[PDB]
Amino acid sequence: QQTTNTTSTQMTNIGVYVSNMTDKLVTPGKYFSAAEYHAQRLKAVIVIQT
Amino acid sequence: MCDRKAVIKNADMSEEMQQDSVECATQALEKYNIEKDIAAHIKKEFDKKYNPTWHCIVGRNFGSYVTHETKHFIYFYLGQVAILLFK
Amino acid sequence: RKAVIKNADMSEEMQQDSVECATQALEKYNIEKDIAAHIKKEFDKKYNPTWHCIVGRNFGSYVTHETKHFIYFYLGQVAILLFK
Amino acid sequence: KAVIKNADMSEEMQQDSVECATQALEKYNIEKDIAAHIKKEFDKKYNPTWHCIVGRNFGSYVTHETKHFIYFYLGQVAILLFK
Amino acid sequence: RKAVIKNADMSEEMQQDSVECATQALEKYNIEKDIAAHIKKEFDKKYNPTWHCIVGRNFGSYVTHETKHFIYFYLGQVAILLFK
Amino acid sequence: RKAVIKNADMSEEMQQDSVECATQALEKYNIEKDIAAHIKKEFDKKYNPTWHCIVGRNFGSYVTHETKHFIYFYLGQVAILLFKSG
Amino acid sequence: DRKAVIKNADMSEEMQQDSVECATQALEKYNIEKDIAAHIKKEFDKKYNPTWHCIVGRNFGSYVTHETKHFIYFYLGQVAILLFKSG
Amino acid sequence: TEEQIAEFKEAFSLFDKDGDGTITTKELGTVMRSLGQNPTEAELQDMINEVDADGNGTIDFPEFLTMMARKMKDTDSEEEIREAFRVFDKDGNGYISAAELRHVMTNLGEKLTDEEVDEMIREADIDGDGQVNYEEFVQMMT
Amino acid sequence: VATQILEGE
């Protein structure tokens, strides 16, 4: 039995100042499409059934 | 390739899924300049990957109070474009 | 402030409560996050979790909801998403 | 208002829980005393031994007998019944 | 993190076993549900089932336990109720 | 396999002997009657007659034993109640 | 009308009717197998001397060591009842 | 060769539902997995389609030899099966919920039947906790 | 057992 988590977010603007120590610098990774891995998952489900 | 920096404000997932969210947001941005099709592309790709459901909100100015499942929440940036994805 | 509903998917009393709660949310809270904080909290205590609220001026969203639990409207110049 | 997250029984016991929870809301101010009343009402009517956990923030792994498990929300208060 | 005990109804070795089992659960997991689950699973490794664990910060409970299997303690600012 | 002292009157060596006898039992037999039959001959030669035990997944008991001569535990999903009377 | 199917009883026949009726009233009064076995054993210890033992449930495997003419095993509907005098 | 022909002839002799030297197409996959091969059901549909053009349902010895050859030009793997299970692994811990297991094997692809799913659960002996050690489970499955 | 949590512990 799981309980749910609820958060809050805020933009930045003139007079709006959010702390940036918790910000993480993550560059974009190697680009891939999510449909390719679902097609691979369809193949693997088929192969498991085989 | 436009070097749009990925600034993550809040990510309640794992890193390999946060990176996939960033990449899907970039592909949706290059596919369409409309946030409707951007959020539709992100939601349909993540629904194709992970079975139950997903919900995506893409925009430059929005305040979102949402309740999510565990390990199924992210709010990040892509340049000046903010993307929310949660289950 | 005028209220324009682009599309609604409930009855007349439900969308009327969406307008009045958003009006009270806008008059009391002014952070659009806090406006969304007020609306979903108000809609949770009477019409059950799990509601979801998005308040802003520029956002695009694709969502999936249960039947008879989804609205999308305006109030002045603020467009508010409210889906289950 | 009852917000059922997971109900492993038939709806009659859930309806009884909703009714006595409304009565306890009118009778008592605090969800602590309401939590006491929830267990003390349903232990004797449906035999020993029931267990009840009520709070606003808790994680739990549960062991229950079949058709005797519920988890719901009264407003912002989460109530859990099991064996 | 400090392990203070509110109610203990077992032996000292069993108390310390519960303390270390809660410590490893909080170090391994950050969700209260997974922490209580890990306490009950490292109890499910070396102890017979029908144990029960609850991990949280704002929760009360009313339970009836068998003899010599009831503890309720704190580890940091998180309350753990472990009864059987 | 896992072990508590659920409800018992034995000492620690008696509890450990019961646990290891049960571990030798389920790895050999599959029917709870034969699990009980394994509990018979291993325990009556070691701690003298007369002992009775119930093994199974769903039952209920009310028991009168000798002093220091009761045990209850859950080896896996199967419960074991071993006591001495006589 | 839950049928009492006797499986085995090296025992008398005035007493198996008492066992069947005692299990019947215990199953009517309680839904808890410990309470059913406690009621059966308390009745049999009061009227037929200590010490009895009673097992009430649906699936189990046993060994007993009873007295002469003091062993009962039957079914009440789908509830197996075991009762033997030892001590 | 001789040993292959001997094993194949033994297999068809013990698969002879009548003894006439012909085998019904319904047990074709049973014969193929009898002879140690690992074909897909899509493949099975394909070559019953391209062998059963005459419509008699009876197949002969030289065409047996050709189709055993055309499936003999195949290979197998185990790491692919392990990776397929590790995709179902949500995290890198080797534990998946059995409810999600049943959802995938009964809702996606050529959906497995309830009898088959429950038979796999009973034969693989899932303990009551719901946590499954897929290393040993795949070891016993293979 | 009577276990409960006060407001704002």
PDB file of N, CA and C in Angstrom, chain A residues 4-41:
ATOM      1  N   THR A   4       0.612   8.846  -1.670  1.00  0.00           N
ATOM      2  CA  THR A   4       0.949   9.729  -2.775  1.00  0.00           C
ATOM      3  C   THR A   4       1.730  10.950  -2.302  1.00  0.00           C
ATOM      4  N   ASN A   5       2.613  11.434  -3.172  1.00  0.00           N
ATOM      5  CA  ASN A   5       3.416  12.623  -2.922  1.00  0.00           C
ATOM      6  C   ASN A   5       2.915  13.777  -3.780  1.00  0.00           C
ATOM      7  N   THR A   6       2.880  14.972  -3.196  1.00  0.00           N
ATOM      8  CA  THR A   6       2.386  16.162  -3.872  1.00  0.00           C
ATOM      9  C   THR A   6       3.382  17.298  -3.681  1.00  0.00           C
ATOM     10  N   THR A   7       3.735  17.967  -4.780  1.00  0.00           N
ATOM     11  CA  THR A   7       4.808  18.950  -4.795  1.00  0.00           C
ATOM     12  C   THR A   7       4.297  20.311  -5.249  1.00  0.00           C
ATOM     13  N   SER A   8       5.206  21.287  -5.237  1.00  0.00           N
ATOM     14  CA  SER A   8       4.936  22.643  -5.698  1.00  0.00           C
ATOM     15  C   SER A   8       6.111  23.154  -6.522  1.00  0.00           C
ATOM     16  N   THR A   9       5.806  23.915  -7.574  1.00  0.00           N
ATOM     17  CA  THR A   9       6.815  24.464  -8.472  1.00  0.00           C
ATOM     18  C   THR A   9       6.532  25.937  -8.735  1.00  0.00           C
ATOM     19  N   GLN A  10       7.590  26.686  -9.045  1.00  0.00           N
ATOM     20  CA  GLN A  10       7.475  28.121  -9.267  1.00  0.00           C
ATOM     21  C   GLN A  10       8.469  28.546 -10.341  1.00  0.00           C
ATOM     22  N   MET A  11       8.062  29.511 -11.166  1.00  0.00           N
ATOM     23  CA  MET A  11       8.893  30.014 -12.252  1.00  0.00           C
ATOM     24  C   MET A  11       9.900  31.023 -11.698  1.00  0.00           C
ATOM     25  N   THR A  12      10.560  31.756 -12.594  1.00  0.00           N
ATOM     26  CA  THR A  12      11.367  32.912 -12.230  1.00  0.00           C
ATOM     27  C   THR A  12      10.950  34.103 -13.087  1.00  0.00           C
ATOM     28  N   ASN A  13      11.025  35.294 -12.503  1.00  0.00           N
ATOM     29  CA  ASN A  13      10.565  36.520 -13.149  1.00  0.00           C
ATOM     30  C   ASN A  13      11.202  37.701 -12.424  1.00  0.00           C
ATOM     31  N   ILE A  14      10.711  38.905 -12.710  1.00  0.00           N
ATOM     32  CA  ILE A  14      11.203  40.103 -12.040  1.00  0.00           C
ATOM     33  C   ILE A  14      10.683  40.114 -10.609  1.00  0.00           C
ATOM     34  N   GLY A  15      11.600  40.024  -9.648  1.00  0.00           N
ATOM     35  CA  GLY A  15      11.246  39.913  -8.252  1.00  0.00           C
ATOM     36  C   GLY A  15      11.104  38.496  -7.743  1.00  0.00           C
ATOM     37  N   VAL A  16      11.076  37.506  -8.631  1.00  0.00           N
ATOM     38  CA  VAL A  16      10.975  36.102  -8.252  1.00  0.00           C
ATOM     39  C   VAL A  16      12.384  35.533  -8.204  1.00  0.00           C
ATOM     40  N   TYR A  17      12.745  34.934  -7.071  1.00  0.00           N
ATOM     41  CA  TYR A  17      14.110  34.484  -6.819  1.00  0.00           C
ATOM     42  C   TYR A  17      14.065  33.146  -6.095  1.00  0.00           C
ATOM     43  N   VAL A  18      14.279  32.068  -6.843  1.00  0.00           N
ATOM     44  CA  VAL A  18      14.297  30.710  -6.312  1.00  0.00           C
ATOM     45  C   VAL A  18      15.747  30.295  -6.116  1.00  0.00           C
ATOM     46  N   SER A  19      16.019  29.595  -5.015  1.00  0.00           N
ATOM     47  CA  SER A  19      17.371  29.135  -4.725  1.00  0.00           C
ATOM     48  C   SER A  19      17.834  28.124  -5.768  1.00  0.00           C
ATOM     49  N   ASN A  20      19.106  28.229  -6.158  1.00  0.00           N
ATOM     50  CA  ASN A  20      19.659  27.429  -7.245  1.00  0.00           C
ATOM     51  C   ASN A  20      20.744  26.466  -6.772  1.00  0.00           C
ATOM     52  N   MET A  21      20.860  26.245  -5.462  1.00  0.00           N
ATOM     53  CA  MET A  21      21.824  25.269  -4.968  1.00  0.00           C
ATOM     54  C   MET A  21      21.358  23.839  -5.206  1.00  0.00           C
ATOM     55  N   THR A  22      20.047  23.610  -5.235  1.00  0.00           N
ATOM     56  CA  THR A  22      19.499  22.284  -5.489  1.00  0.00           C
ATOM     57  C   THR A  22      19.372  21.970  -6.974  1.00  0.00           C
ATOM     58  N   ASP A  23      19.651  22.931  -7.849  1.00  0.00           N
ATOM     59  CA  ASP A  23      19.588  22.687  -9.283  1.00  0.00           C
ATOM     60  C   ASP A  23      20.739  21.791  -9.722  1.00  0.00           C
ATOM     61  N   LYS A  24      20.450  20.881 -10.647  1.00  0.00           N
ATOM     62  CA  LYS A  24      21.427  19.928 -11.151  1.00  0.00           C
ATOM     63  C   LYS A  24      21.691  20.199 -12.626  1.00  0.00           C
ATOM     64  N   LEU A  25      22.968  20.288 -12.989  1.00  0.00           N
ATOM     65  CA  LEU A  25      23.376  20.522 -14.373  1.00  0.00           C
ATOM     66  C   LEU A  25      23.490  19.168 -15.060  1.00  0.00           C
ATOM     67  N   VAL A  26      22.486  18.823 -15.860  1.00  0.00           N
ATOM     68  CA  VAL A  26      22.473  17.582 -16.625  1.00  0.00           C
ATOM     69  C   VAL A  26      22.344  17.951 -18.095  1.00  0.00           C
ATOM     70  N   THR A  27      23.371  17.630 -18.877  1.00  0.00           N
ATOM     71  CA  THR A  27      23.315  17.841 -20.313  1.00  0.00           C
ATOM     72  C   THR A  27      22.349  16.837 -20.946  1.00  0.00           C
ATOM     73  N   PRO A  28      21.745  17.184 -22.087  1.00  0.00           N
ATOM     74  CA  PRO A  28      20.958  16.193 -22.829  1.00  0.00           C
ATOM     75  C   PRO A  28      21.811  15.004 -23.251  1.00  0.00           C
ATOM     76  N   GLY A  29      21.243  13.809 -23.105  1.00  0.00           N
ATOM     77  CA  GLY A  29      21.954  12.578 -23.371  1.00  0.00           C
ATOM     78  C   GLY A  29      21.863  12.155 -24.824  1.00  0.00           C
ATOM     79  N   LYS A  30      22.214  10.892 -25.061  1.00  0.00           N
ATOM     80  CA  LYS A  30      22.144  10.320 -26.400  1.00  0.00           C
ATOM     81  C   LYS A  30      20.687  10.161 -26.816  1.00  0.00           C
ATOM     82  N   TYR A  31      20.331  10.752 -27.954  1.00  0.00           N
ATOM     83  CA  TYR A  31      18.931  10.861 -28.340  1.00  0.00           C
ATOM     84  C   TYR A  31      18.391   9.523 -28.831  1.00  0.00           C
ATOM     85  N   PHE A  32      17.235   9.133 -28.301  1.00  0.00           N
ATOM     86  CA  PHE A  32      16.548   7.920 -28.715  1.00  0.00           C
ATOM     87  C   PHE A  32      15.048   8.166 -28.672  1.00  0.00           C
ATOM     88  N   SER A  33      14.322   7.399 -29.479  1.00  0.00           N
ATOM     89  CA  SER A  33      12.871   7.484 -29.537  1.00  0.00           C
ATOM     90  C   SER A  33      12.257   6.421 -28.638  1.00  0.00           C
ATOM     91  N   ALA A  34      11.189   6.798 -27.935  1.00  0.00           N
ATOM     92  CA  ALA A  34      10.540   5.878 -27.010  1.00  0.00           C
ATOM     93  C   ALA A  34       9.742   4.795 -27.725  1.00  0.00           C
ATOM     94  N   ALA A  35       9.365   5.017 -28.987  1.00  0.00           N
ATOM     95  CA  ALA A  35       8.624   4.009 -29.737  1.00  0.00           C
ATOM     96  C   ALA A  35       9.506   2.851 -30.184  1.00  0.00           C
ATOM     97  N   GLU A  36      10.805   3.097 -30.383  1.00  0.00           N
ATOM     98  CA  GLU A  36      11.730   2.033 -30.768  1.00  0.00           C
ATOM     99  C   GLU A  36      11.823   0.970 -29.681  1.00  0.00           C
ATOM    100  N   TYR A  37      11.905   1.396 -28.423  1.00  0.00           N
ATOM    101  CA  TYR A  37      11.997   0.429 -27.338  1.00  0.00           C
ATOM    102  C   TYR A  37      10.666  -0.259 -27.070  1.00  0.00           C
ATOM    103  N   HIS A  38       9.537   0.370 -27.408  1.00  0.00           N
ATOM    104  CA  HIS A  38       8.270  -0.352 -27.323  1.00  0.00           C
ATOM    105  C   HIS A  38       8.135  -1.377 -28.443  1.00  0.00           C
ATOM    106  N   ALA A  39       8.658  -1.070 -29.633  1.00  0.00           N
ATOM    107  CA  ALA A  39       8.700  -2.074 -30.695  1.00  0.00           C
ATOM    108  C   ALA A  39       9.607  -3.238 -30.310  1.00  0.00           C
ATOM    109  N   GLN A  40      10.748  -2.929 -29.687  1.00  0.00           N
ATOM    110  CA  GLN A  40      11.626  -3.968 -29.159  1.00  0.00           C
ATOM    111  C   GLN A  40      10.932  -4.769 -28.060  1.00  0.00           C
ATOM    112  N   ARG A  41      10.111  -4.105 -27.243  1.00  0.00           N
ATOM    113  CA  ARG A  41       9.365  -4.804 -26.203  1.00  0.00           C
ATOM    114  C   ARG A  41       8.298  -5.716 -26.796  1.00  0.00           C
TER     115      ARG A  41
END
